[PDB]
Amino acid sequence: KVTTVVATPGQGPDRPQEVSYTDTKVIGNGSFGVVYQAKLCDSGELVAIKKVLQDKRFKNRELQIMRKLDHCNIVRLRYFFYSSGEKKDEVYLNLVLDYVPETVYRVARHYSRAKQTLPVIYVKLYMYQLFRSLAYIHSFGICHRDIKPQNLLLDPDTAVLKLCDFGSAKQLVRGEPNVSYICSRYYRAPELIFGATDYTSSIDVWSAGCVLAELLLGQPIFPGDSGVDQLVEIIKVLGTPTREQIREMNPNYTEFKFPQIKAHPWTKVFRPRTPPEAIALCSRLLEYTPTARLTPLEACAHSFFDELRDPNVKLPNGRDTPALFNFTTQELSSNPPLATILIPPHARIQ
Ligand SMILES: CS(=O)(=O)N1CC(c2nc(N)ncc2-c2ccc(F)cc2)C1
Ligand SMILES: [Cl-]
């Protein structure tokens, strides 16, 4: 069995190409539609096809975003094509994406079942690359709005992390309100829990912080099946938000008091041997006030990631770390002066 379609490439000019794929497996499916795996007939490479029902009145926001994006820490849209087949007057948008075997979710859980934590070196590598991808998309004013371990793809050999699933992603314009029900359970910023509709891209930074803390703890940091339950687990760590903090998160005062608990020292949250810099980084990501959180780029420049800027740094398997320093002007526009930290001396050699 061999499907052949005429697809438009994700990047580059509109040059339609005959794409032929086989071994059409299935994997996940939910809020969008089905997701298949396949093998491309020529190159032999594996790819993931995300099929979704196409709306006639508007064009697909995921597609529109995916096409603008080109970055080595973000899944590549290789092609896209429209199809249907059988019952209904339904048009399906198919997104052909690079297949990436593992996810931070699966990896984290392997370590968690075996009562281990992921070696800090991998925490650094994975977290740094996430923050790069955030710095990039945020530079276009695009918020992902669903940062969680399941959406962080990993190549285990190269230690390369790629952000994926832009189904929730959106251009956040100041003054324009946005839906407050977007982020997944454990990774929602307090302002989202409080139902704020004037949130900024800092929600991604909170989410990322929840991933960091989770990789350090070996389990979700702010669990709970309700918002109430989540906010309690948060307050247990951060302490009770001041009236100031509360108005910063959500001006539309949903309106009620919380149990006055003081901040359980961040040091006592983690294992004894946990690097003090990792803890420091957490506390600067997981802040009540959206504007007080680090930017993605400021996070990349955090001391916690110093080891990665060492010229001698290698992966435990002996291979080189992936390219961490080739920042574009786009990536740096947030705050160009930071390049003095981000790009280390040995990366400037001619
Ligand atoms: C709908 S989705 O593409 O966002 N979702 C992520 C996941 C995925 N995406 C790509 N591009 N490549 C691989 C995978 C994936 C990885 C591990 C696994 F067990 C299942 C799917 C499927
Ligand atoms: Cl042509």
Residue numbers in the entry: 36 to 385
Quote the paper.
Glycogen synthase kinase 3 beta (GSK-3β) is a serine-threonine kinase known for its ability to regulate glycogen synthesis and to play a critical role in many intracellular pathways, such as the signaling pathways involving insulin, growth factors, and neurothrophins (Wnt pathway and insulin pathway the most known). In contrast with most kinases, GSK-3β is constitutively active, being inhibited in response to a specific stimulus, and it can only act on a pre-phosphorylated substrate. The central role of GSK-3β in many intracellular pathways makes this enzyme an exciting and puzzling target for drug discovery. This widespread activity has also led to identifying GSK-3β dysregulation as responsible for the development of many diseases, such as Alzheimer’s disease (AD), bipolar disorder, diabetes, cardiovascular diseases, and cancer. In this work starting from a 19F NMR fragment screening, two fragments able to bind the ATP binding site of GSK-3β were identified and characterized through biophysical assays.
